[PDB]
Amino acid sequence: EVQLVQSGTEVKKPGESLKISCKGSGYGFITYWIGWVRQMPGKGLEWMGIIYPGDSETRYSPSFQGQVTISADKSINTAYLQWSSLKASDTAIYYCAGGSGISTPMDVWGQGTTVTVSSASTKGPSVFPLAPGGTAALGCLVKDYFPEPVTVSWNSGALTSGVHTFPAVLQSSGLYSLSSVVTVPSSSLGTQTYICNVNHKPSNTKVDKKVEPK
Amino acid sequence: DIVMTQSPDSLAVSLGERATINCKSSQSVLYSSINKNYLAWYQQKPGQPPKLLIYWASTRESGVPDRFSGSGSGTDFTLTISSLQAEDVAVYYCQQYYSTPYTFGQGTKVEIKRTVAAPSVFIFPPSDEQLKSGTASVVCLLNNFYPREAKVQWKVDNALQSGNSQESVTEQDSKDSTYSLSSTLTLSKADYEKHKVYACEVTHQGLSSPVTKSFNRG
Structure with a gap:
């Protein structure tokens, strides 16, 4: 059995250096050549480089030739990918994958690491209500938070039917915001209570918002 | 390469x-x-x-x-x-x-692929707790529609707004194979109380004429 685990997600400012650890375990990791691949938030996949512990890290992409340095430490079987200096475009998810030889497909993958570069500070969100043919819409607007992500559930999780939580959108100020919505029959609009439980772990904030029309 | x-x-x-x-x-x-x-x-x-x-x-x-x-x-x-x-x-x-x-x-x-579905459009006025913060944000919601390609346009007193609203769409719903769209128009309080009516205009192949749903401030 072959596995690959990556380090925790990272938040930084443009300028510093950082590194991702990709550790391998299982029967016969020795033969596996590890490649790195980036997935920018909106776009798709793109191959950065490949390296074999034991150092034949010869292969890079021309697009990523001058940007980053990769490496490996055979002793602990991990493998790293390095950055001299970050920019705002470096915010992406990064995976390490394994193939058994030079010209082989990447059969086994890692969990992936999210990196965020912003020059912005961590701040707790602000929640606001979204109150109104028997299809009354409700919602919560979670505004101006950083960094990602937040977890929003409804009514303590009891209610699930018709709930939509949109992906975050990075705004002008460099902070995120998203909205959750649920449609309910008009007949329940005073009788039943609606509370959205947003959770933002980086700011350690837990907010419950009761939405009501008037 | x-x-x-x-x-x-x-x-x-x-x-x-x-x-x-x-x-x-x-x-x-x-x-x-x-x-x-x-x-x-x-x-x-x-x-x-x-x-x-x-x-x-x-x-x-x-x-x-x-x-x-x-x-x-x-x-x-x-x-x-x-x-x-x-x-x-x-x-x-x-x-x-x-x-x-x-x-x-x-x-x-x-x-x-599924039978073309028309969006259930809803309009949400900004909250009073947000006005005390200093900025107002009107929200326009499109619910359960197919296909995914739809477009919304903002009008403040029927003055076309652009570049001020940000959109966000959901993934294809596993149960009913449909999407949903939220357009957030972020505006300042002083400019929000300068005008009267706020409108979001929706266009979709599932509707014969553009549907516009709007609210008057107050």
């Missing part, structure tokens, strides 16, 4: 019908000696690392069902699915492990 282009940017097919994806190469990925091509296919679903689905253009992996069959050789390759099921909605890539550096494909999202 060898560049690969997948044929359909967006591809929508009904349930149980076959789908077709193709890849093309400026060079050849076939080593004549062993007659084996060096092209793989991966699948990835939203919020999860990509999983390999085919190696050498025809060989599957341990978890890959017999419904997925690779094909082609040389410079045209085809990923064919015999019967599209609900769990197979994902984005597929094709890469080459022939000559380094290695390259991935553009991407091919697979929707589930």
Whole structure:
């Protein structure tokens, strides 16, 4: 059995250096050549480089030739990918994958690491209500938070039917915001209570918002 | 470098019908000696690392069902699915492990075709707790519609607004195979109380005339 685990997600400012650890375990990791691949938030996949512990890290992409340095430490079987200096475009998810030889497909993958570069500070969100043919819409607007992500559930999780939580959108100020919505029959609009439980772990904030029309 | 282009940017097919994806190469990925091509296919679903689905253009992996069959050789390759099921909605890539550096494909999202559905449009005025903060944000919501391609336009006193609203769409709903859209118009308090009426205008192929739903301030 072959596995690959990556380090925790990272938040930084443009300028510093950082590194991702990709550790391998299982029967016969020795033969596996590890490649790195980036997935920018909106776009798709793109191959950065490949390296074999034991150092034949010869292969890079021309697009990523001058940007980053990769490496490996055979002793602990991990493998790293390095950055001299970050920019705002470096915010992406990064995976390490394994193939058994030079010209082989990447059969086994890692969990992936999210990196965020912003020059912005961590701040707790602000929640606001979204109150109104028997299809009354409700919602919560979670505004101006950083960094990602937040977890929003409804009514303590009891209610699930018709709930939509949109992906975050990075705004002008460099902070995120998203909205959750649920449609309910008009007949329940005073009788039943609606509370959205947003959770933002980086700011350690837990907010419950009761939405009501008037 | 060898560049690969997948044929359909967006591809929508009904349930149980076959789908077709193709890849093309400026060079050849076939080593004549062993007659084996060096092209793989991966699948990835939203919020999860990509999983390999085919190696050498025809060989599957341990978890890959017999419904997925690779094909082609040389410079045209085809990923064919015999019967599209609900769990197979994902984005597929094709890469080459022939000559380094290695390259991935553009991407091919697979929707589930369904009878065209009209959005349930709702309009939300900004909260009073947000006005005390200093900025107002009007929200326009589109609920349960197909296809995904729809567009909304903001009007303040029927003055066209642009570049001030940011959009956000959901993934294809697994149960009813539909989407939802939220457009957030962020504005300042002083400018919000300078005008009277606020309107969001929706256009979609599922509606004969553009639907506009709007609120008057107060």
